[PDB]
Amino acid sequence: SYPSLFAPLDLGFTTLKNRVLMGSMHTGLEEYPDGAERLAAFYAERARHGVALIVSGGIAPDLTGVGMEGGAMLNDASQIPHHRTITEAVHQEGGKIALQILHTGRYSYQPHLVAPSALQAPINRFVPHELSHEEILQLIDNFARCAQLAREAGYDGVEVMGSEGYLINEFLTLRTNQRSDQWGGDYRNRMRFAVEVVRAVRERVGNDFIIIYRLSMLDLVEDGGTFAETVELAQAIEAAGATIINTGIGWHEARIPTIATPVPRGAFSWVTRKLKGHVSLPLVTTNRINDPQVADDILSRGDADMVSMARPFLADAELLSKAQSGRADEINTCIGCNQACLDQIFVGKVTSCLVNPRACHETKMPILPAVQKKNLAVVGAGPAGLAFAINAAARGHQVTLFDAHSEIGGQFNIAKQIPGKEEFYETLRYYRRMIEVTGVTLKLNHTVTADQLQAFDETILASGIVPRTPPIDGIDHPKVLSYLDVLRDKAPVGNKVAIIGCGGIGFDTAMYLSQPGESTSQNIAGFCNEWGIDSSLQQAGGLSPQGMQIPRSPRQIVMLQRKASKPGQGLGKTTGWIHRTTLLSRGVKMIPGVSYQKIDDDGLHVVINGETQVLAVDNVVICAGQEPNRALAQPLIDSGKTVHLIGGCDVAMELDARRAIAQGTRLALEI
Ligand SMILES: CCCCC[C@@H](C/C=C/C(=O)SCCNC(=O)CCNC(O)C(=O)C(C)(C)COP(=O)(O)OP(=O)(O)OC[C@H]1O[C@@H]([n+]2c[nH]c3c(N)ncnc32)[C@H](O)[C@@H]1OP(=O)(O)O)SCC=O
Numbered sequence: 001s002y003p004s005l006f007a008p009l010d011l012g013f014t015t016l017k018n019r020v021l022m023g024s025m026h027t028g029l030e031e032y033p034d035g036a037e038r039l040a041a042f043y044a045e046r047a048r049h050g051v052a053l054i055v056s057g058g059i060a061p062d063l064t065g066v067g068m069e070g071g072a073m074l075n076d077a078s079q080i081p082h083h084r085t086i087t088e089a090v091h092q093e094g095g096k097i098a099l100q101i102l103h104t105g106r107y108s109y110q111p112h113l114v115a116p117s118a119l120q121a122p123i124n125r126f127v128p129h130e131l132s133h134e135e136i137l138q139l140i141d142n143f144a145r146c147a148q149l150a151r152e153a154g155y156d157g158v159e160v161m162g163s164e165g166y167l168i169n170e171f172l173t174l175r176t177n178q179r180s181d182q183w184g185g186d187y188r189n190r191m192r193f194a195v196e197v198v199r200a201v202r203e204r205v206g207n208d209f210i211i212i213y214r215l216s217m218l219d220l221v222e223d224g225g226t227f228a229e230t231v232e233l234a235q236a237i238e239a240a241g242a243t244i245i246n247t248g249i250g251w252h253e254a255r256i257p258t259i260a261t262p263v264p265r266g267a268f269s270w271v272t273r274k275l276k277g278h279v280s281l282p283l284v285t286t287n288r289i290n291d292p293q294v295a296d297d298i299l300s301r302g303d304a305d306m307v308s309m310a311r312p313f314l315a316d317a318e319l320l321s322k323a324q325s326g327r328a329d330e331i332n333t334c335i336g337c338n339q340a341c342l343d344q345i346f347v348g349k350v351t352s353c354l355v356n357p358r359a360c361h362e363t364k365m366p367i368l369p370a371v372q373k374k375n376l377a378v379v380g381a382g383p384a385g386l387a388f389a390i391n392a393a394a395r396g397h398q399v400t401l402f403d404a405h406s407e408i409g410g411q412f413n414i415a416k417q418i419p420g421k422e423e424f425y426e427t428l429r430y431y432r433r434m435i436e437v438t439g440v441t442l443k444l445n446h447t448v449t450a451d452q453l454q455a456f457d458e459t460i461l462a463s464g465i466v467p468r469t470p471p472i473d474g475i476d477h478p479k480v481l482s483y484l485d486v487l488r489d490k491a492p493v494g495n496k497v498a499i500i501g502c503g504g505i506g507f508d509t510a511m512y513l514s515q516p517g518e519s520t521s522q523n524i525a526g527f528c529n530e531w532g533i534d535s536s537l538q539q540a541g542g543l544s545p546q547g548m549q550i551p552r553s554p555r556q557i558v559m560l561q562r563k564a565s566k567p568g569q570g571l572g573k574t575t576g577w578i579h580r581t582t583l584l585s586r587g588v589k590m591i592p593g594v595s596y597q598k599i600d601d602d603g604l605h606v607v608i609n610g611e612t613q614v615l616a617v618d619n620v621v622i623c624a625g626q627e628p629n630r631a632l633a634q635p636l637i638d639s640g641k642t643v644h645l646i647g648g649c650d651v652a653m654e655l656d657a658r659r660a661i662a663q664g665t666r667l668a669l670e671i
């Protein structure tokens with residue numbers, strides 16, 4: 001029912017079965033023990049389920065281009081068997097795969113990093129070495145070498161990565177390129193590197209080889225490029241020999257969100273659409289395309305010739321086969337949380353997925369029939385229970401999922417109500433449908449007791465959490481409201497608010513209470529307006545002259561925490577800054593190193609910088625953490641019954657949804 005999505009594309013010398021490309025994703029397996037074998041199975045499954053063309057994670061052409069010391073690299077015929085193992089696994093399934101050639105430029109977290117000029121990145125501790133003319137020529141030959149090897153390894157093509165602020169991208173902008181050389185100055189010299197790279201690659205591999213160039217169409221940084229430059233380069237790259245041009249949005253330094261959940265679906269399709277007609281090469285659009293209808297609509301509307309989807313393939317390898325068979329409701333949607341994927345590879349760990357713990361770990365987490373069937377009982381329909389339930393039932397076990405609420409979801413029913421997190425609705429729709437599919441007997445409105453119902457071979461407690469009630473003097477005062485009272489029970493909240501407890505929930509509560517109106521997470525034009533994106537792309541880096549336009553918060557909010565470190569420091573590495581910037585632009589205040597005296601009619605008495613203060617607030621919201629709820633933990637052990645604890649009722653400290661699901665999933669696959 002997605003005609004455009006599944007239409008073949010003729011590339012002259014070969015054909016792609018459909019218009020879907022699995023976007024490049026550095027998984028961290030590239031430079032891992034048995035990565036070759038794990039990536040092979042990782043990719044084969046996506047190819048087995050329809051992906052027309054896959055683009056591997058970025059791989060360095062030389063040594064100065066790696067991402068982190070010891071990073072993935074392809075510069076020796078010796079590494080061919082590695083990749084051969086991968087291309088062959090994909091080909092056996094009837095798919096295709098291209099290798100991305102990426103040189104991280106001034107972004108590599110390594111001392112020997114090289115760039116067009118000696119200009120330190122705002123997010124890198126190292127100062128790059130300004131490349132010399134002869135070094136650049138060698139790099140250009142290195143890219144060709146890289147492609148030669150990829151082709152030898154059996155890849156269907158390569159992607160020359162010229163965006164996100166990496167090396168090639170850096171040569172293009174005057175923000176990073178200040179050379180007086182022939183590789184700097186006017187735009188014609190600045191393009192020289194990108195064009196020369198693709199031209200050297202084309203010559204080296206011949207005509208029958210797919211060459212993708214990921215063009216940066218929206219830098220999102222001061223002194224970035226203009227649309228006129230974007231167009232000239234695109235046509236230049238076409239003439240250089242590229243087969244396909246892919247879209248690149250933003251730089252890592254960009255202070256505007258490009259892939260996180262607050263980013264609306266298909267938020268940047270309009271950008272790729274602006275290039276249409278300026279080149280004859282097929283164009284791929286990307287970012288936050290996680291639904292078959294959205295992708296199909298983008299294609300049918302003519303926004304692009306192909307759509308790229310990276311994270312959705314971590315979330316569900318069967319995304320396309322389900323789409324093509326009318327089972328879109330069974331798609332485990334990527335919610336753009338970045339928690340298990342981007343946040344992890346950023347700290348040098350293997351990427352995974354919050355809703356799919358098996359992502360990039362399918363070989364190490366096999367789903368065997370069933371050691372031997374059993375009649376199980378799961379208490380709690382939160383992500384912990386849900387993950388275990390459908391995974392155990394798909395194994396053959398009989399599962400009975402109980403939950404005191406009128407609907408499955410647990411805390412996710414609160415999370416989904418936070419502006420910029422409505423994507424959570426999808427995960428619940430998915431589990432709701434998978435319950436039916438795997439045969440899980442669901443029983444809602446059931447508050448289970450250690451006695452009431454327990455004739456099960458084994459029990460799996462996935463009960464929740466108990467919000468923390470800080471022992472502050474006057475904690476029962478009328479002004480005091482827990483986060484549940486505000487978020488779940490919609491309790492009235494005055495104009496002036498003090499929030500006790502920063503970190504996760506505290507930030508979401510503040511997002512909610514400061515919401516100026518409708519969320520831009522569902523309004524492309526609004527999102528672009530709030531973040532200062534220039535729709536004409538005529539401004540350098542596509543930044544509107546008037547800058548950001550985040551509305552004022554309808555309320556006066558102050559967030560507080562006792563630790564002295566910067567509030568929000570413990571949030572997700574790639575998403576915390578977004579929320580922090582949003583809140584601060586809305587006028588919310590965040591104060592560290594706070595001591596709470598008491599709560600009375602005068603408000604909230606505290607101590608800041610060693611001086612007492614009275615916060616004349618209309619309400620004090622408690623977001624002071626959680627503690628595990630094990631109500632049935634002992635009543636079950638004191639009843640000689642085998643019981644298991646997963647998710648929040650086992651650990652509440654740093655137990656978010658990822659640990660919850662991975663835990664329930666691990667139990668489910670073992671039991
Ligand atoms: C982004 C994580 C790396 C992923 C690598 C993988 C490839 C990924 C490709 C992609 O396209 S991912 C999608 C697009 N990119 C993103 O979404 C990332 C956006 N950026 C971020 O999330 C973060 O900035 C991140 C890079 C993760 C972390 O940065 P960090 O080290 O924690 O520092 P931070 O917390 O972000 O702080 C940066 C500080 O310096 C300032 N700053 C930064 N940029 C600018 C600028 N342009 N103008 C002015 N000031 C700036 C800030 O005011 C801030 O000050 P402070 O007081 O907080 O210290 S593997 C590559 C292998 O070769």
Ligand SMILES: Cc1cc2nc3c(=O)[nH]c(=O)nc-3n(C[C@H](O)[C@H](O)[C@H](O)COP(=O)(O)OP(=O)(O)OC[C@H]3O[C@@H](n4cnc5c(N)ncnc54)[C@H](O)[C@@H]3O)c2cc1C
Pocket residue numbers: 337339379380381382383384385402403404405409410411412414415418446447448449462463464465487505508509629631646647648649655656657658660
């Ligand atoms: C506003 C907000 C935003 C959040 N945002 C994020 C985010 O962006 N990312 C992330 O990873 N995590 C986030 N979390 C935490 C996330 O929602 C997970 O739900 C949590 O980490 C673990 O869920 P769980 O399955 O262990 O239990 P829960 O989701 O808490 O569910 C336990 C369930 O069992 C039931 N139960 C309890 N006792 C009994 C009993 N005696 N009988 C029957 N049923 C019982 C309840 O009905 C409840 O639904 C957020 C939480 C809130 C409140």
Ligand SMILES: NC(=O)c1ccc[n+]([C@@H]2O[C@H](COP(=O)([O-])OP(=O)(O)OC[C@H]3O[C@@H](n4cnc5c(N)ncnc54)[C@H](OP(=O)(O)O)[C@@H]3O)[C@@H](O)[C@H]2O)c1
Pocket residue numbers: 337339468470471500501502503504505506560561562563564570571572575623624625626652653654655656657
């Ligand atoms: N997806 C994401 O981006 C993301 C980001 C962050 C967290 N999470 C997860 O989502 C959940 C949200 O958890 P949470 O914020 O409610 O709890 P929490 O952040 O994990 O921990 C409690 C917080 O409240 C404060 N606090 C604790 N005891 C207190 C007391 N007695 N008095 C006053 N203040 C106190 C602490 O700050 P001080 O001690 O400094 O006062 C601390 O930051 C967690 O499970 C977390 O792992 C997800």
Ligand SMILES: Cc1cc2nc3c(=O)[nH]c(=O)nc-3n(C[C@H](O)[C@H](O)[C@H](O)COP(=O)(O)O)c2cc1C
Pocket residue numbers: 023024025026027056057058059100102161214259286287288289308309310311312341342345351
């Ligand atoms: C874990 C992870 C690794 C990524 N690695 C790369 C990479 O090596 N090269 C690259 O060009 N883009 C990389 N990206 C960016 C994706 O190619 C893509 O542009 C972005 O995630 C698109 O959003 P989507 O996931 O919503 O489709 C990565 C993204 C993630 C989440």
Ligand code: SF4
Pocket residue numbers: 311312314315333334335336337338339340341342352353354355356
């Ligand atoms: S971690 Fe969140 S962002 Fe990453 S892939 Fe899974 S669901 Fe999407």
Ligand SMILES: [Cl-]
Pocket residue numbers: 061062063064075
């Ligand atoms: Cl080298």
Ligand SMILES: [Cl-]
Pocket residue numbers: 350
């Ligand atoms: Cl791992």
Ligand SMILES: [Cl-]
Pocket residue numbers: 405406407
């Ligand atoms: Cl309810």
